[PDB]
User: What shape does this take?
Amino acid sequence: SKGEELFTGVVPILVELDGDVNGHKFSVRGEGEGDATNGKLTLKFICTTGKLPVPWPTLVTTFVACFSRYPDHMKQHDFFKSAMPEGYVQERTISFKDDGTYKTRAEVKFEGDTLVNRIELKGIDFKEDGNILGHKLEYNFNCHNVYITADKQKNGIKANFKIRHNVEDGSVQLADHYQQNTPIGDGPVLLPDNHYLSHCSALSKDPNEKRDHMVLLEFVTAAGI
Assistant: This one.
């Protein structure tokens, strides 16, 4: 309806993250474009404080489900666009198996014509020579399905899902995601039936960027059970 109309074209995106992980304070700024018609996101992120203290792949899921492609038969289940323009809060705990935890709180909303994802992150209990602080994760990303359910209690959605990061030694690092989203505004939103968002992502580098950075391409499509 009104919310969907905001995504019919290409939408500029701004991402801002302030983080602290095991006492290391850092900031990231990203920008790019979303094309929800094709479920497509393109973003480039720069660590504005120097070297990023964690591997870039561990922040991919933190750095805009409103750009997912919901097929015609599923448009009644698109909570994320229905909350726009006032937006939604996205909160996660990400538990890295046998390692530390991230806690994140983000607001995703329009600021003028730009879709803005503004995030605060706190990371604790990381091992000094684990896969995260030891920078042992490969610079790549796998496809994942995220099971989305309506929150039985709070006018939003929830998702619990496993993310798997390839490690340089051939192993896999699991990151258990616990997610809740709630609208910022008081207007009516769409509360979905159980469904999936299927994600695939590709990471790359800008050959002319001297700062620590990540280029991200994501494709996301909704699918029913």
In short: The longest strand covers residues 10-21. The CA atoms of residues 96 and 175 lie 4 Å apart. Helices lie at 2-5, 79-82. The chain has two helices and eleven strands.
